[PDB]
């Protein structure tokens, strides 16, 4: 299936911590992905014969910025794609990918941002997770902080990853405190807060926009992993998460037959539905990705090996693994990304290299 068709290296020689294909490409335009590393974001276009065409970068004013993460959305009025980036400065930048202008930025975390994710039905709802232990939900249409997910019952150390479920009714987050926490955003309070955030125009009122303080997860566990949890993804109602213990665990809150929407905050059980082991991934901040349909899952390890799991099987534990190696690919792979149509997989590395694999 996948064959390695090209690679390159970016000129800064620092880790590429993130990669994302733009899944909002217009019909008939070439496939495009963004990489983030050092103080820059760079866009590339995929062409035939494995060509990876360099386009243009956004380079931060601060030489000490270090971007960690990026996420694509689009402008909800014009349809044009937008790219959000963030990293150690704790500043979210919204980038026009065509000109690479910083259209606007958001501050509040003040503290490093480890991940950004956009809501799967509302292109304006951006979630950030921070070294300051909180998540924040932003509305990038009205430029409002809708809610802060924190408090002593929230995360007690850096939050490293988070994912919305299929309809963006709830969020699972995870971090350095070894726990995975659920935060429901379809509550009456949260739905109202979002609606109010769309009604907010500071030119038409005197009040500041009030943010929700959400201090209580809807479920919490520390029973899945025994070290920093660095990546989490919903799979329907189940969860896929990993730590730096050479495993992705597939699990769910509660007991085997418990409905996710009936789980109470005080739920003390989880169910393990399978575990996908692999090797040489004991460093933290190593993220897996899935294709658009959630048929497959790719993870790179710290010596440049790729694992891909076929999840198109009746139960999670029946996943079929294949691996992808190249003799010149030896640096740690921080993240992978599939093109929308699943024909291309990209891996980015700690030595600033980019690896292209075609189906």
């Amino acid at each position: 299936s996948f064959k390695c068709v090209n690679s390159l290296k970016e000129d800064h020689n620092q880790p590429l911590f993130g990669v994302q294909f733009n899944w909002h490409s217009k019909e008939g335009d070439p496939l495009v992905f963004a990489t983030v590393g050092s103080n820059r974001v760079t866009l590339y276009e995929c062409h035939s014969q494995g060509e990876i065409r360099l386009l243009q970068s956004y380079v931060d004013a601060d030489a000490d910025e270090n971007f960690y993460t990026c996420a694509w959305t689009y402008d909800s009025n014009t349809s044009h794609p937008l790219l959000a980036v963030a990293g150690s400065r704790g500043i979210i930048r919204i980038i026009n990918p065509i000109t690479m202008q910083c259209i606007k930025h958001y501050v509040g975390h003040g503290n490093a941002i480890n991940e950004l994710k956009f809501h799967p039905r509302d292109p304006n709802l951006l979630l950030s997770v921070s070294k300051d232990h909180a998540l924040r939900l932003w509305n990038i249409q009205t430029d409002t902080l809708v809610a802060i997910f924190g408090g002593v019952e929230g995360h007690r150390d850096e939050v490293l990853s988070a994912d919305y479920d299929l309809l963006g009714e709830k969020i699972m987050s995870c971090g350095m405190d070894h726990s995975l926490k659920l935060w429901r955003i379809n509550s009456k309070r949260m739905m109202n807060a979002i609606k109010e955030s769309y009604d907010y125009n500071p030119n038409k009122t005197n009040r500041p926009f009030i943010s929700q303080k959400i201090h209580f997860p809807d479920f919490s566990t520390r029973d899945i992993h025994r070290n920093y949890v660095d990546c989490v993804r919903w799979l329907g109602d189940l969860i896929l998460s990993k730590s730096c213990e050479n495993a992705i665990v597939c699990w769910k809150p509660g007991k085997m037959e418990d409905d996710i929407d009936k789980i109470k905050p005080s739920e003390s059980n989880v169910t393990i539905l399978g575990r996908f082991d692999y090797s040489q991934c004991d460093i933290w901040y190593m993220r897996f990705s899935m294709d658009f349909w959630q048929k497959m899952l790719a993870l790179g390890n710290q010596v440049g090996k790729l694992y891909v799991w076929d999840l198109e099987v009746e139960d999670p534990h029946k996943a079929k693994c294949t691996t992808l190696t190249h003799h010149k690919c030896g640096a740690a792979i921080r993240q992978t990304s599939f093109s929308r149509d699943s024909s291309i997989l990209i891996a980015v590395c700690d030595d600033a290299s980019i690896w292209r694999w075609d189906r």
Binding site: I283, W284, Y285, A332, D350
Partner: peptide, 5 residues
């Protein structure tokens, strides 16, 4: 736990 090798 190391972020890097």
């Amino acid at each position: 736990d190391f972020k890097t090798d």
